[PDB]
Amino acid sequence: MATTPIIHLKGDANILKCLRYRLSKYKQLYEQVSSTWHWTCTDGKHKNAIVTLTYISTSQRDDFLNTVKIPNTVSVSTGYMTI
């Protein structure tokens, strides 16, 4: 038993860098956040990095994307680390 539901917030590296501040406001449901990175690599960046957050229970994951006021510039994508 483990269930490690995570989400991918894609949008910008500067928006996600300061997004962690809002995650602190809702820590009761937030667990940890990954370092904003980018899918693959061609030469540098282009305003489009996704970070991997993680919660404790599956209900805490859906509550995060439906409770904290995430920035519209970013986009939450269901995820499942299963680890």
Place this chain on the structure above:
Amino acid sequence: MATTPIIHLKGDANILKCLRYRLSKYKQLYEQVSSTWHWTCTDGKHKNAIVTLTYISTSQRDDFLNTVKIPNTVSVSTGYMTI
């Protein structure tokens, strides 16, 4: 229907950077690889970055970690982007 099985190869940023070369040898089952990043961030790095790979079918995921000779320095962890 989608099933996007992915794996996390944690170990080193230099070992994972050159690991992509081996992934090319087995592209028939490999699909795409993510940019080696690090879980969270305290100040810099410390030889421990994880990359997110992706396959086409679930059977292709288990075959990747059981077919390509991955480096022992790294570690494959089951993953499920579900996206």
